[PDB]
Design a protein that fits this description.
GO molecular function, one term (chains A, B): zinc ion binding
Organism (chains A, B): Lactococcus lactis subsp. lactis (strain IL1403) (Streptococcus lactis)
Protein name (chains A, B): Zinc transport transcriptional regulator
Helix content of chain A: 55-70%
Largest interface: A-B, 40 and 40 residues
Shape of chain A: elongated
Strand content of chain A: 5-15%
Strand order of the largest sheet of chain A: 1-2
Largest sheet of chain A: 2 strands, antiparallel
Pfam families (chains A, B): MarR
Radius of gyration of chain A: 20 Å
Number of strands of chain A: 2
Oligomer: homodimer
Keywords (chains A, B): DNA-binding, Metal-binding, Transcription, Transcription regulation, Zinc
């Protein structure tokens, strides 16, 4: 039989191999803008990142014509950002992938009782640490 | 609070990030040869790989002067392979890393009862599948 240590080793090897086959900030803005027009400030708050990081990601998305700025109809000083037509199916495709992935994790989790899920949760947190 | 699905998603993201920061056959031969001189046949059996794959990996290791061929003192037709002096500390360093990694997984596993470990084992097998 196989030790749990070896099972864990093999499992992590499989996830790392799969890895070896848009930044995440950019893709998170895409997803956010897919749901509501927003400002730099709003984006920084919702994403929990610095204003410099938001400006940097917004610039990359703009260069790619994934998003576009406009002026708040109420206030001429506030710049709003929204998806371009070109970005609509990009964001939709990313949102769908994310949702499907999470659904898969959720269905797997649902095969376990709350008590079992707590075991799994503690296991994953402790193992996460070894990789942070 | 955070759903298990989201915990799993974040956990896999961390392992994949860590990944984004010698082939495994070659390194397995190094480790094997670190413990005993062997032939192509022996290597293929122990590693569960094709003779072509072994020849391919042996050639790469030889080019790198990590291993060297010699003739079986008993039989002139059989080629044995062993580490070179240069490879000794390479294999030692790899063996030590592997052992340390497994020790870490083992110590983490030891914080869980056999029953909890079974929960974790089933969880990991089912999740592995999603990535094979």
């Amino acid at each position: 039989g196989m030790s749990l240590a070896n099972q864990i080793d093999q499992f992590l090897g499989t996830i790392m191999q799969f890895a070896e086959n848009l930044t995440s900030t950019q893709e998170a803005i895409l997803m956010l803008l897919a749901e509501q027009i927003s400002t730099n400030a709003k984006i920084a708050e919702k994403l929990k990142i610095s204003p410099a990081a938001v400006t940097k990601a917004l610039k990359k998305l703009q260069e790619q014509e994934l998003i576009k700025s406009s002026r708040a109809t109420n206030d001429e000083r506030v710049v709003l950002w929204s998806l371009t037509e070109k970005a609509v199916p990009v964001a939709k495709e990313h949102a769908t992938h994310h949702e499907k992935t999470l659904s898969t994790y959720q269905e797997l989790g649902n095969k376990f009782t709350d008590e079992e899920q707590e075991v799994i949760s503690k296991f994953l947190s402790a193992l996460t640490e070894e990789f942070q």
